Design a protein that fits this description.
Globin-like; C-phycocyanin; mainly alpha; homodimer; dissociated subunit; photosynthesis; binds phycocyanobilin
Amino acid sequence: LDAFAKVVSQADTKGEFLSSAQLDALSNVVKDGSKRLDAVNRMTSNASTIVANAARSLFEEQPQLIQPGGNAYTNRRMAACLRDMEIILRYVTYATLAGDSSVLDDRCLNGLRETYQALGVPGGSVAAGVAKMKDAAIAIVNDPNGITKGDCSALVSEIASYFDRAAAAVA
Amino acid sequence: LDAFAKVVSQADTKGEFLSSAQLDALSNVVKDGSKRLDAVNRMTSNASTIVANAARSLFEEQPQLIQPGGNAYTNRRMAACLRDMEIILRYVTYATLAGDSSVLDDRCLNGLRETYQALGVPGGSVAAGVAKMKDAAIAIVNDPNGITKGDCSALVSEIASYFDRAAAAVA
Ligand SMILES: *[C@@H](C)[C@H]1/C(=C/c2[nH]c(/C=C3N=C(/C=C4\NC(=O)C(CC)=C4C)C(C)=C\3CCC(=O)O)c(CCC(=O)O)c2C)NC(=O)[C@@H]1C
Ligand SMILES: *[C@@H](C)[C@H]1/C(=C/c2[nH]c(/C=C3N=C(/C=C4\NC(=O)C(CC)=C4C)C(C)=C\3CCC(=O)O)c(CCC(=O)O)c2C)NC(=O)[C@@H]1C
Ligand SMILES: *[C@H](C)[C@H]1/C(=C/c2[nH]c(/C=C3N=C(/C=C4\NC(=O)C(CC)=C4C)C(C)=C\3CCC(=O)O)c(CCC(=O)O)c2C)NC(=O)[C@@H]1C
Ligand SMILES: *[C@H](C)[C@H]1/C(=C/c2[nH]c(/C=C3N=C(/C=C4\NC(=O)C(CC)=C4C)C(C)=C\3CCC(=O)O)c(CCC(=O)O)c2C)NC(=O)[C@@H]1C
């Protein structure tokens, strides 16, 4: 409704009906909103798979994490690791829904590096796990089956930026 | 983006991903936006037909308006009458696009009765012309050909309210 009211102001200033350009512009706002909801829906609905695929890739790459002495050794520690990735993924979907990183920053990333240091969690391995969630999430967002075909590339880039910001915040 | 950010706040307060209810709610916001744009597009694109159909119905019903002594007698007066209906229709599409009557009131309806009195234009006949534009506009908005089938009844009621407000403002 924000973009619609601004277009009214512009048309009224001209004293004209909406132009074809203004109608296509507003139509693209509605299309972008719908694509954004598909991305949030696909990431939300598949949240456990995104977490599991990333964790599997991280542990296979960094087996020390789940060998004796590792920070994610024993299932109890492993489970808390999966829970952390779920939390970060949750705030990435919030950012995707809102179109900005304000909640992701204020509620999740601000001070998170310092929580991990208080705990001895290796933030650089959290960053790798977040970057792997990114790739799993994007493969799910970009799957063309089950959805109206179209371009989601700008949205996928924006989603990648949220994952990269979260990873860089904890490294 | 306004409704999306509010949903984020609610989900974060719960500490959860978006629920299916919140996703359906936001999906209906995008659907309603698209339907609203169809209504504005259909009324804008057919503006001349909406004006002409209403004027034809008004003049046939009130022939004195275009007989000698009438306020819309001679084509010059007739043309200014059609131009007035076009203006009011324009601000009704602004209200439909914005979802409220704030611009329609402030820019079009406020003081319009007093302009017509300064001119001797019979406001009650303007009101009849506006009410006939309403019926022509709604028949165009509600036509099911050329568009995805669905319910537009709440939108059509809101559009009728804008036309009725404009008519009642000049009667
Ligand atoms: C990018 C992520 C992928 C993709 C997205 C895409 N979707 C559309 C169309 C729509 N998506 C929705 C969203 C919903 N409908 C519902 O019922 C719900 C709740 C379960 C949601 C979240 C809607 C309403 C539409 C419009 C109707 C439709 O189904 O088509 C498009 C087309 C947008 C456009 O017109 O340009 C796109 C691109 N499609 C891809 O190919 C990407 C993989
Ligand atoms: C009520 C007025 C009538 C009606 C509306 C209706 N439309 C949809 C679907 C869509 N309408 C649009 C709008 C545009 N697409 C463009 O390219 C442009 C610029 C020319 C505009 C303004 C869009 C993007 C959609 C979604 C994709 C599609 O074409 O379907 C619906 C379905 C909404 C829903 O999912 O519930 C409806 C109901 N349909 C009727 O039957 C009324 C007569
Ligand atoms: C997984 C990729 C890595 C991993 C994680 C890990 N975390 C813990 C414990 C905690 N994680 C948090 C994180 C948060 N709390 C919040 O409120 C938010 C945002 C809103 C975040 C991101 C916290 C507070 C804790 C401590 C309390 C709790 O566990 O609930 C562990 C257990 C630590 C231990 O020594 O047992 C682990 C293992 N560890 C790895 O090695 C992976 C790289
Ligand atoms: C048509 C249904 C009725 C009709 C109309 C009529 N109007 C005029 C002249 C004017 N109409 C306006 C109205 C507006 N100016 C604005 O800025 C706005 C909103 C932004 C409105 C609604 C104005 C200012 C005028 C005077 C200046 C001008 O004509 O541009 C006439 C001509 C009056 C005359 O005596 O020649 C007519 C006929 N008359 C009817 O009988 C219909 C019921």
